[PDB]
């Protein structure tokens, strides 16, 4: 059983490095955050359909993080430079540890086409995100391509997103924003990711079991 002290459910699921990780505990029963967590999204933004997720995750009886897409699998996109002083780890610029902020590599961001099949026998909660940069210079600095999209499909999901380029008030130094999404893959369903920029890719996901059944 995990009740969170310093962290929102969203921040903990994504791996906000400012939050206690409990590296010694690999499994849990259920998760519930408290009223005013000190840490939410170190890089500022919005977690979509958050109340439905919290409602679901309070009803779970088993919960276990697994790696589904290794960070080292990214060979033509930079998987190490996507960090920010907004997300410090031991003081150094870092990021949510359970996703990967993919960056262009050799001044190119080729189109990503990636699929993941939940061959486990439990439901799998999968998280991803999109980066909305502050201006066009940052858009091409990070992703090369000026005009980008993120396309996510399952058997029941068919989402296509375009980033908004807009300057926002600084939160933790950041005038950009990120938007995070989640879905539940049933056993043997697949998820498909396609993007030519601004994609915050899964690395880790969560096997979940709902009480009874």
């Amino acid at each position: 059983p995990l009740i969170l002290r310093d962290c929102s459910v969203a921040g903990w699921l994504l791996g906000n490095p400012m939050c206690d990780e409990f590296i010694n505990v690999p499994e849990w029963s259920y998760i519930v955050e408290k009223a005013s967590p000190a840490n939410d999204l170190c890089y500022p933004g919005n977690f979509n359909d958050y109340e439905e997720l919290k409602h679901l995750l309070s009803r779970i009886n088993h919960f276990e993080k697994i790696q589904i897409i290794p960070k080292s699998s990214w060979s033509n996109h930079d998987a190490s430079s996507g960090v920010s002083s907004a997300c410090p780890y031991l003081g150094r610029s870092s990021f949510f540890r359970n996703v990967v902020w993919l960056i262009k590599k050799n001044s190119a961001y080729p189109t990503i086409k990636r699929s993941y099949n939940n061959t486990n026998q439990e439901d799998l909660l999968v998280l991803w995100g999109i980066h909305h940069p502050n201006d066009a210079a940052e858009q091409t600095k990070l992703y090369q391509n000026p005009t980008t999209y993120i396309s996510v499909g399952t058997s029941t999901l068919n989402q296509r997103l375009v980033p908004e380029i807009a300057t926002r008030p600084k939160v933790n130094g950041q005038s950009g924003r990120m938007e995070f999404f989640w879905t539940i893959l049933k056993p043997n369903d697949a998820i498909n990711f396609e993007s030519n920029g601004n994609f915050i890719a899964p690395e880790y996901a969560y096997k979940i079991v709902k009480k009874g059944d």
Partner: antibody
Amino acid sequence: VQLVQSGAEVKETGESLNISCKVSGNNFPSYYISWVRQMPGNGLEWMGRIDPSDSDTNYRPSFQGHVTISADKSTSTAYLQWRSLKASDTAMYYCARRATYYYGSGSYFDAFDIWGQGTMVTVSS
Amino acid sequence: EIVMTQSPLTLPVTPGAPASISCRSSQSLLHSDGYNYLDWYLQKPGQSPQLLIYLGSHRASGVPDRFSGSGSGTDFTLKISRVEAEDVGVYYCMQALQTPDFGQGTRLEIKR
């Protein structure tokens, strides 16, 4: 999932030909379909591939120009097309699906896991 | 192009005995993700090619466990632990690091 190829054909040198490879199912997820040539008695030669969902197409440069590859998204059917056949186009043509996906706890699958039954092309008068 | 070289091109083996087919590439097939991008296919007489091994050493579903693949870099081996009658056909390795190139193919001969 099955790849269903169109029937065997005979055409004369200089005539047009279009052969098809249909991905059964909903084609989700959509994978690249490769075309492979086998000359009589010979080995396998990769010609090109296409993702039927967006028609992104890669050609082996040695085959490009003589043959074109296209796709129809709604039916998820790939095509190999000749404008003017030569006798050296007489061959068996296979299509193949390149399933590429992560699974389990971060394991990876990358292979031609499903193959069509082959389409025999005879170029003759 | 990556030149794929198979040896031998014709492989006679005693029924029930082990067999081994070597495949060498002109350039390393080890990718930065840690995998070797090398496949083995079997084409039985009159049939389409079928997948045996993928990513160098991973046996495809429904393939008898008598088949296995090994190697790394430029040196790869398909091993058949016990050669059965139903294994006759031509065996191909294929690099998938670039656009595919197949080896020439190895014909398996059963010395009944």
